[PDB]
Ligand binder design. Structure first.
Ligand code: NA
Ligand code: NA
Ligand code: NA
Ligand code: NA
Lengths: 211, 211
């Protein structure tokens, strides 16, 4: 959840918002170790419920998200249902555990390609065009992350947009991402420079992957 | 319906068969003028019912077809239901009137392209990958005719097969067609040559479009 003013500005300027619970457990092995554990249900529930109680009157919020990269666990299913129960006015999405689980109203993969399948075990990233028409699948598809804009990038961006316009159920996506997470440091002359991972003696670190 | 020996041979050698009613009214304007007319229902029903009564014990016959190029009329809907009622063992298909009407269990277009839409009014030929995922659509797609093999042709055949293999619900199709409809004529010396439309004094005629 963002600083409270963000939503007011999105209401007044006009931007659709996905409001997202502060739950990410990416570093667990496997990813759902905590989110499938009922002992962590209370902590997770507060991060979802208190978000909804705070932000439910903002028109700019159109979709609730259960968080990010925390696999898929039974706690997600419980909290998916909690939101559906308390606020039927908004769809609920969540990408973890393969992007099309029972905890999401929207097929919302990250970096699924336009034409190319990536058949990873358990959590494949199907071509988005193919994903829509998998046996029994009916949901809309909106990428929670796509077109990774790291440095000299966005090659193939036009390919996504051509597909979005051709396929009714391909309803777009959210580019990753808006702004480089660089921080300002100062050299011996006092001149500013843009710093990334490692530049603060932080270790281990993932270098420029924050930009 | 074919010569009776054909089904026996397909049973024994092993070929899946679509058994098709002798109903085509292509030249009508519009194409469904007779097939939407209750006065033509009796003549139409016999072409369907007597086919079913004849061929229903052949294992090779796996799909019934209501005919070809006769638009979509209420008579198709009635006859579709008649088959479903008398023989639940086989799907019923029919391409007329847009290839995805209420008279077909299978989306069965002719000459729908792999990637390229052909948005004709009333009867569009969607990209086959797109067609599958149109809002609410769930059926399998098998082209009743594709890859028109007229003369020096079958360009882009590999594109179909790549798509058939990638998409579960794209289940193939039937090439148009097997054999040139050329006829033998003899020159002054009695030497045989291959004849087509118009070569018999027949007029009007459509020339080589039979090959
Ligand atoms: Na779209
Ligand atoms: Na990053
Ligand atoms: Na297939
Ligand atoms: Na022809």
């Amino acid at each position: 959840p963002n600083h409270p003013l963000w939503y007011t500005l999105c209401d007044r300027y006009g931007l659709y918002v996905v409001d997202e619970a502060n739950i990410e457990t990416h570093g667990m092995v496997p990813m759902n170790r905590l989110t499938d554990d009922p002992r962590w249900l209370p902590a997770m529930s507060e991060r979802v419920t208190r978000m909804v109680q705070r932000d439910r009157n903002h028109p700019s919020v159109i979709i609730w998200s259960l968080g990010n990269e925390s696999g898929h666990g039974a706690n997600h299913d419980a909290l998916y249902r909690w939101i559906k129960s308390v606020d039927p006015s908004r769809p609920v999405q969540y990408e973890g555990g393969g992007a099309d689980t029972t905890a999401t109203d929207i097929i919302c993969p990250m970096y699924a390609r336009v034409d190319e399948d990536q058949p990873f075990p358990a959590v494949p990233k199907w071509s988005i065009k193919k994903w829509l028409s998998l046996p029994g699948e009916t949901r809309p598809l909106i990428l929670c992350e796509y077109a990774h804009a790291m440095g000299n990038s966005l090659g193939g961006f036009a390919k996504y947009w051509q597909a979005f316009r051709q396929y009714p159920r391909l309803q777009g996506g959210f580019v990753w991402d808006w702004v480089d997470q660089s921080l300002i440091k100062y050299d011996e002359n006092g001149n500013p420079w843009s710093a990334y991972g490692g530049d603060f003696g932080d270790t281990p670190n993932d270098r420029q992957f924050c930009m």
